[PDB]
């Protein structure tokens, strides 16, 4: 069968509320985390709109539809995902209210478009430039993490947040594709996020007394085997006949023993001095007497690293992907102003740091070693994704729904279309705006309206952006509050808001097909 006429709509918009509902506080300092033992069945913990989407198994088609378009804006924002979900249903109801009143959804969709642009047009009006400084970096990083985690954990991380982004402005890079190298430490304590302007490896391998403190860092990061498979292989796995698998292994340890001697002069060519520290990093294992005799050379050596690490160390340390243990150039082999193999818990974590490139930069979170440790991780990365937008645009604006009322004050009063047919969609459009501040505040405190009129009146007074104080549920000017949206996010949202809320408003049917 099929669902046509209104039925192609209701089920979609009816699904778009409880969806919108549960995460109504996933957001802002009022935001509340959710778990899943349900969707993927595991023990899971998450706060974000798009992120809690995918984790569930969502059999309602619309629930999967926003996840796509939200992910687009989710990428750069990392917050407002949960937000954009909320205004769309807030929009869908009014349009539904029109079709409930009765009306044509496409002329209603037609009613969004001027209003959207008018709001977009208003969005550059309301975008106020706070250029990039740690304050704007703080207040956006926290308001993102105040959204994503505790304002406590926000300001706990807001240091670590601005930590890496200082060197990405050294990169002059409006985005962070590195310094986003994050290490998650085994500890009891969540809150500890350690800035390392180099990388961290969990390695330093299997051997101590390698001079795990390396002041002159010369890094060979290699995939060469100082250790390797003992497993039976002929074609690469167990062969039908047994014996031909055997002839391979007797060249392994000999190859490894030889490369030890190759590192000797590779220590002597490069350094000749144990006082000049040399670092090997193997992507594979390393036999003990390798590291042991490599410890004899004044070399620390790290078996079994990762591709990012190799490259990040190739980057941060000015290091290498170089493949050999034979005598190589020290200038090739990268450098860090300091290197140490650090131990918290069981594993010895090499802190490599003051690296030639302060490019891939460790923010090292300690933690309970849980989904909680997984939880505290994902947010700060998005806390950046907030402030990168702040780094992106010059315009950083008061958050907590400060922009929303002024638009409804801007838009509706004079008809932005000067035309009711669109004003229909406009009146629908400018109601979507208000939910997030008024739903969070009323969740966090005093209501939508009696709070609205306070945010309204002060907007109606000033037109200045008075946001919400979510510490109460009452309005304040979100400039001073520090909760600060950028122009980017709010720019991006109407795009992700409208275009998805339109084409689905114009579904003329839905059918199980094949």
């Amino acid at each position: 069968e099929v669902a046509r006429a209104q039925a192609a709509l209701a089920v979609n918009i009816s699904a778009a509320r409880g969806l919108q509902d549960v995460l109504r506080t996933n957001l802002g300092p009022k935001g509340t985390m959710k778990m899943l033992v349900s969707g993927a069945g595991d023990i899971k913990l998450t706060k974000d709109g798009n992120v809690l989407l995918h984790e569930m198994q969502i059999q309602h088609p619309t629930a999967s539809l926003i996840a796509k378009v939200a992910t687009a804006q989710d990428d750069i924002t990392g917050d407002g995902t949960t937000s954009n979900v909320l205004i769309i249903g807030e929009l869908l109801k009014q349009a539904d209210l029109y079709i409930s009143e009765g009306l044509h959804p496409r002329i209603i969709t037609e009613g969004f478009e001027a209003a959207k642009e008018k709001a977009l047009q208003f969005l550059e009006e309301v975008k106020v430039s706070r250029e990039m400084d740690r304050e704007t970096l703080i207040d956006v990083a926290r308001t993102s993490l105040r959204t994503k985690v505790h304002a406590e954990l926000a300001d706990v991380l807001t240091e670590a947040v601005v930590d890496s982004i200082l060197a990405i402005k050294k990169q002059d890079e409006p985005i962070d594709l590195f310094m986003i190298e994050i290490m998650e430490m085994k500890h009891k304590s969540e809150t500890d996020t350690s800035l390392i302007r180099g990388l961290v490896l969990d390695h330093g391998a299997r051997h101590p007394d390698m001079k795990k403190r390396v002041e002159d860092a010369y890094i060979l990061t290699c995939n060469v085997s100082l250790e390797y498979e003992k497993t039976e292989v002929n074609s690469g796995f167990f062969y039908k006949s047994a014996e031909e698998r055997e002839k391979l292994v007797k060249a392994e340890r000999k190859f490894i023993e030889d490369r030890v001697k190759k590192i000797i002069e590779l220590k002597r060519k490069v350094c000749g001095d144990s006082d000049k520290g040399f670092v090997v990093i193997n992507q594979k294992g390393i036999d003990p007497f390798s590291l042991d005799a490599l410890s004899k050379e004044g070399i620390v050596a790290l078996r079994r690293a990762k591709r990012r690490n190799m490259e990040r160390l190739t980057l941060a340390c000015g290091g290498v992907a170089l493949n050999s243990f034979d005598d190589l150039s020290p200038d090739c082999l990268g450098h860090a102003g300091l290197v140490y193999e650090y131990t918290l818990g069981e594993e010895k974590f090499t802190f490599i740091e003051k690296c030639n490139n302060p490019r891939s930069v460790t923010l090292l979170i300690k933690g309970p070693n849980k989904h909680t440790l997984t939880q505290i991780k994902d947010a700060v990365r998005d806390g950046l994704r907030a402030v990168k937008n702040a780094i992106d645009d010059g315009c950083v604006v008061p958050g907590a729904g400060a922009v929303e009322v002024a638009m409804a004050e801007a838009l509706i009063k004079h008809k932005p279309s000067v035309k009711g047919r669109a004003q229909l969609g406009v009146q629908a459009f400018a109601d979507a705006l208000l939910i997030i501040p008024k739903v969070l505040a009323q969740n966090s405190g005093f209501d939508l309206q009696e709070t609205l009129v306070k945010i309204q009146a002060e907007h109606s007074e000033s037109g200045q952006l008075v946001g919400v104080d979510l510490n109460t549920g009452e309005p304040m000017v979100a400039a001073e509050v520090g909760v600060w949206d950028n122009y980017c996010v709010k720019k991006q949202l109407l795009h992700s808001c409208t275009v998805i809320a339109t084409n689905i408003l114009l579904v003329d049917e839905i059918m199980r097909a094949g």
């Binding site: 088609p61 999967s64 009306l103 044509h104 084409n503 003329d508 049917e509 839905i510 059918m511 097909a513």
Partner: protein, 509 residues
């Protein structure tokens, strides 16, 4: 087995319920359709065709609609979404009256008595467009390519379709086949950008060219099509026993060689350098072409050679034993194998045959290439439509309410039984107003009146409603245009189907 008034009503239901949802998806203003699957597959489309695929049909009328849907899709690929909206109406209108007024037959003949009055009205409302003015084509094209809502780099490359298709317009059959699209053979270029995407003459040969097989750049020397019939003859015209032992290797493979060397000469005699030989090549046929240092390009496909037979526009050799430069390598010709982005691209150009031109498609990626080509595909189809009939017609209900009157005027005139089928068929024309009044979201019944009021004097000549403007409008003031080609086609198409399903009362296992 399914039979009878059921299938009769079933001829209604299927084509009806098909056409029903789809008019909302018609028009530049269009109301999209959602799909879901028990598989979970979700589809948001204004595209009937794409819909017409993933949907299921448990009735062969619903199945044969897909057939006649692909008919217009075989033809163009647009208006298919439109054609279904016509007959689905018709059977849903005339039949239940007129089949309970008892006949398959009356409206059948009246379907023709419908088909002509359109053509009649078409000779008025459709007014000629010239291919000399690009915009005069391109405004239809700009309207046709914005149908799929990419005006960006499609439009400027639609000039290339406005050129390539128009410049592969050729082959008068004496009733003049020339109006056409297909002879335009798209180029695929990694790298470049639709900006620098521009026609070269004949057919630009991408397909078999990942690398030069034909020199590098050839200007005068003739690009030459050798077509089968290059296999040896060990006898005069015959073939005797082949190589077996010592001197047969000599004698026989020599017997093979002379006949081909004899075939070879006639190629070299017309001065080639590159020679493209499709299948049916001898290594004997190449090596004397190698003895003349004239590259013989072997075992390459037919359309590609027909592209090349359209690229220098030479023919394909029908008597490879007696060869002419008039046969292959005509004119001066050109052959140019160019790396643009990744791939070497053979350009066989300076075409004889009336020009010929193919769309150079250069995207940065193949995506930014493809987005253009898909809307380009509208132009090159509308180009051939402008080539077919170069009479631009006012869009919207301009043709609809026009023919409706003229049909009901033909009802007033003929005053027979088929007057009622007219008033049944003339009722089908109002779809576009209803479709557009839907897609604008206005009130039809006033605009129905107002368009009859537009016909009451203007005859709805250029005046339909355009839901995209939302109002009843001259389509000259909106510049909305289509060739009489595309109109009658789509018009006639479902009329045939309106006959078709109405013919069918019976299914038997």
């Amino acid at each position: 087995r399914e039979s009878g008034r059921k299938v009769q009503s079933g001829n209604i239901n299927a084509a009806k319920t098909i056409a029903d949802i789809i008019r909302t998806c018609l028009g530049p203003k269009s109301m999209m359709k959602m799909l879901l699957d028990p598989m979970g597959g979700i589809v948001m489309t204004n595209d009937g065709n794409a819909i017409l695929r993933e949907i299921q049909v448990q009735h062969p009328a619903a199945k044969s609609m897909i057939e006649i849907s692909r008919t217009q899709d075989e033809e163009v690929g647009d208006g298919t979404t439109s054609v279904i909206i016509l007959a689905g109406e018709m059977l849903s209108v005339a039949e239940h009256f007129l089949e309970q007024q008892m006949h398959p037959t009356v409206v059948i003949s009246a379907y023709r008595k419908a088909l002509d009055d359109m053509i009649s009205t078409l000779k008025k409302i459709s007014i000629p467009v010239d291919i000399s003015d690009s915009d005069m084509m391109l405004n239809i094209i700009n309207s046709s390519i914005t149908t799929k809502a990419i005006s960006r780099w499609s439009s400027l490359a639609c000039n290339i379709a406005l050129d390539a298709v128009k410049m592969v317009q050729f082959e008068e059959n004496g009733r003049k086949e020339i109006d056409i699209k297909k002879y335009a053979r798209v180029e695929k270029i990694p790298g470049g950008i639709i900006e620098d995407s521009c026609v070269l003459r004949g057919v630009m040969i991408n397909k078999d060219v990942t690398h030069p097989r034909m020199r590098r750049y050839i200007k005068n020397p003739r690009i030459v099509l050798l077509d089968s019939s290059l296999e040896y003859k060990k006898g005069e015209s015959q073939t005797d026993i082949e190589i077996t032992r010592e001197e047969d290797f000599t004698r026989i493979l020599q017997m093979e060689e002379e006949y081909i060397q004899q075939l070879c000469e006639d190629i070299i005699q017309l001065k080639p350098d590159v020679v493209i030989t499709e299948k049916g090549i001898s290594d004997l046929a190449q090596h004397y072409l190698m003895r003349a240092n004239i590259t013989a390009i072997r075992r390459v496909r037919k359309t590609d050679n027909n592209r090349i037979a359209r690229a220098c526009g030479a023919r394909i050799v029908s008597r490879p034993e007696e060869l002419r430069e008039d046969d292959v390598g005509t004119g001066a010709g050109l052959l140019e194998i160019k790396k643009i982005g990744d791939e070497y691209f053979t350009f066989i150009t300076d075409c004889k045959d009336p020009k010929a031109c193919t769309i150079l498609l250069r995207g940065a990626s193949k995506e930014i290439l493809s987005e253009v080509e898909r809307n380009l595909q509208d132009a090159m189809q509308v180009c051939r439509n402008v080539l077919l009939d170069p009479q631009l017609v006012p869009g919207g209900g301009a043709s609809e309410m026009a023919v409706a009157h003229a049909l009901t005027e033909k009802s007033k005139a003929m005053t027979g039984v088929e007057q009622w089928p007219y008033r049944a068929v003339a009722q089908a024309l109002e779809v576009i107003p209803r479709t557009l009044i839907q897609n604008c979201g206005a009130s039809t019944i006033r605009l129905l009146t107002s368009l009859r009021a537009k016909h009451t004097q203007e005859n709805c000549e250029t005046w339909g409603v355009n839901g995209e403007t939302g109002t009843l409008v001259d389509m000259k003031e909106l510049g909305i245009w289509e060739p009489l080609a595309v109109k009658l086609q789509t018009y006639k198409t479902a009329v045939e189907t309106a006959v078709l399903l109405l013919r069918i009362d019976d299914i038997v296992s």
